[PDB]
UniProtKB/Swiss-Prot annotation:
InterPro entries: Cyt_P450 (IPR001128), Cyt_P450_CS (IPR017972), Cyt_P450_E_grp-I (IPR002401), Cyt_P450_E_grp-I_CYP2B-like (IPR008068), Cyt_P450_sf (IPR036396), Cytochrome_P450_fam2 (IPR050182)
Upper classification of the organism: Eukaryota, Metazoa, Chordata, Craniata, Vertebrata
Class of this enzyme: oxidoreductase
Its membrane topology: Peripheral membrane protein
Protein name stated in the entry: Cytochrome P450 2B4
Cofactor(s) demanded: heme
Source organism, top-level taxon: Eukaryota
Length: 460
């Protein structure tokens, strides 16, 4: 009754019909032979894969609760363990999502935008200072994306220099590198055998643990300084809701969901945002004309004497369409984040046993040639009608769909916009590599472009 797909061997599963290139490339290859919806065996585990804008939507939207179930990721389950907004399920998840969605919106009393505009203003100020000397943005873009989350959870930001922050940051974002490595992906398949032998997991473990300590401490500092009647941020609030569920012990709001939820926010809403920015600027180096037009749109719709604001977007459909296409091509989460089916489930003739894991190749949507003329080529065109207004697009689900749809799409949207329009507002770019020779070819649960040098040339 499971989707078709090559024969499993026990212990190993479909190890053999996979591609050395990687988890993503493997699926897409099986899709060719076995179709839009197949079953593939990751050792013991049967996984059903959803390729295409229809397949994915039919599950995530047309059957959204069936498919609301989060799945595991092997290298980090030992840290997260089913706790926290991201890896939660059933009741645990809903109450956590309900909470975070509500909470982050309100408190943190400067508005989510404002905090971003401030963070961008600092960026401009910090960038100015390098007087147009080559640099790898990676750090700063980790920094700003991290300072944003920080502002939400801790009620504060960090200077780009303060070196404690950087030490922690450095080792936070070392984890992602490792999370998306080949070793991790092998670990994914056979972690029952590998958890005993040394390998990147242990390293990932101790990087996260180390953070969960600093957080642990920021939580203890919060309780001891708390003003109930005037909360500052996400932790203040989770605490106040914690005491308001004192008498109830089947409630979900305990210390361990607090910690792994604050961590969770860093873990989802940093790299991915940051890498999108990194990638974005890489594309603006390679096709300057776009940049020119964006800088130009900025001159018309915003001018040069005020900062960008989130409202300027509605009137800047080109820029907006670039940011859209940046996400699409960046394809930064390419096989989405594992799902499970909360019930036994009817789908396309097939039946998927309860809790079976489900992988929505989002990349197959992003490069759906029915919704994008030139899917492998960078093309704002993809998002613009005959009158040059923004164009919706079914194939555009980088933040995924259904009930597990990215909780942050929003910050990230606002971030991407306000960072992009504000940087470009103030600096033009250049680099050693001529546009013609810049290469974009990156692959793991997150994709990553190459490292590159760049120049931020102040404009007067
Ligand atoms: C470019 C930026 C971002 C992208 C592309 C992105 C994409 C995604 C995707 C694809 C998922 C999984 C959707 C699924 O369940 O299949 C996800 C999950 C999530 N994202 Fe993001 N995200 C981004 C930024 C952020 C930010 C900035 C935050 C928070 C401030 C955030 C919070 C979350 C949370 C909480 C989840 C868990 C979903 C759940 O279990 O309900 N994300 N993100
Ligand atoms: O006799 C052994 C055979 O090994 C290969 O056969 C298959 C095998 O199934 C396999 O050996 C290999 O497939 C490559 C799979 C490697 C798995 C690596 C994955 C690990 C986790 C996720 C990323 C990649 O190559 C061929 C792909 O179909 C080769 O084709 C030949 O050397 C030979 O026919
Ligand atoms: O009384 C207040 C004291 O705290 C100050 O800052 C603490 C600051 O409270 C605290 O803000 C700072 O944190 C730096 C680490 C931030 C890490 C956050 C990361 C999480 C994961 C992703 C990257 C970001 O650690 C500092 C050093 O211990 C200073 O440490 C002291 O000088 C000062 O006296």
């Amino acid at each position: 009754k499971l989707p078709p797909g090559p024969s499993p061997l026990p212990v190993l599963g479909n190890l053999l019909q996979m591609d050395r290139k990687g988890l993503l490339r493997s699926f897409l290859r099986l899709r060719e032979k076995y179709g839009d919806v197949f079953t593939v065996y990751l050792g013991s585990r049967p996984v059903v894969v959803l390729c295409g804008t229809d397949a994915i939507r039919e599950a995530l939207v047309d059957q959204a609760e069936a498919f609301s179930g989060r799945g595991k990721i092997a290298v980090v389950d030992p840290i997260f363990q089913g706790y926290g907004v991201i890896f939660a399920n059933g009741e645990r998840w809903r109450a956590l999502r309900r909470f975070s969605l509500a909470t982050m919106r309100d408190f943190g009393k400067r508005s989510v935008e404002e905090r971003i505009q401030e963070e961008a203003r600092c960026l401009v100020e910090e960038l100015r200072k390098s007087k147009g000397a080559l640099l790898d943005n990676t750090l700063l873009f980790h920094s700003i994306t991290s300072n944003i989350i920080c502002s939400i959870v801790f009620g504060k930001r960090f200077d780009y220099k303060d070196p404690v922050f950087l030490r922690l940051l450095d080792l936070f974002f070392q984890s992602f590198s490792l999370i998306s490595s080949f070793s991790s992906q092998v670990f994914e398949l056979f972690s029952g055998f590998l958890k005993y032998f040394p390998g990147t997991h242990r390293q990932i473990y101790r990087n996260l643990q180390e953070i969960n300590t600093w957080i642990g401490q920021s939580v203890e500092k919060h309780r001891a300084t708390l003003d109930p009647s005037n909360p500052r941020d996400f932790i203040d609030v989770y605490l106040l809701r914690m005491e308001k569920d004192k008498s109830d012990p089947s409630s979900e709001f305990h210390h361990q969901n607090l910690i792994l939820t604050v961590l969770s926010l860093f873990f989802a809403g940093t790299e991915t945002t940051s890498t999108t920015l990194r990638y974005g600027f890489l594309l603006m180096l390679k096709y300057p004309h776009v940049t020119e037009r964006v800088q130009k749109e900025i001159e018309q719709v915003i001018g040069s004497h005020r900062p960008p604001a989130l409202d300027d977007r509605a009137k800047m459909p080109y820029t907006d369409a670039v940011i859209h296409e940046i996400q699409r091509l960046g394809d930064l989460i390419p096989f989405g984040v594992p799902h499970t089916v909360t019930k036994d489930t009817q789908f396309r003739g097939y039946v998927i046993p309860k809790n079976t894991e489900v992988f929505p190749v989002l990349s197959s949507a992003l490069h759906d040639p029915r919704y994008f003329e030139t899917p492998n080529t960078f093309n704002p065109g993809h998002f613009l009608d005959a009158n040059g207004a923004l164009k919706r697009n079914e194939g555009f689900m980088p933040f995924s769909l259904g009930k597990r749809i990215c909780l942050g799409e929003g910050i990230a949207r606002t971030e991407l916009f306000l960072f992009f329009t504000t940087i470009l507002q103030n600096f033009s770019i250049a680099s050693p590599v001529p546009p013609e020779d810049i290469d974009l070819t990156p692959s793991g649960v997150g994709n990553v472009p190459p490292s590159y040098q760049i120049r931020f040339l102040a404009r007067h």
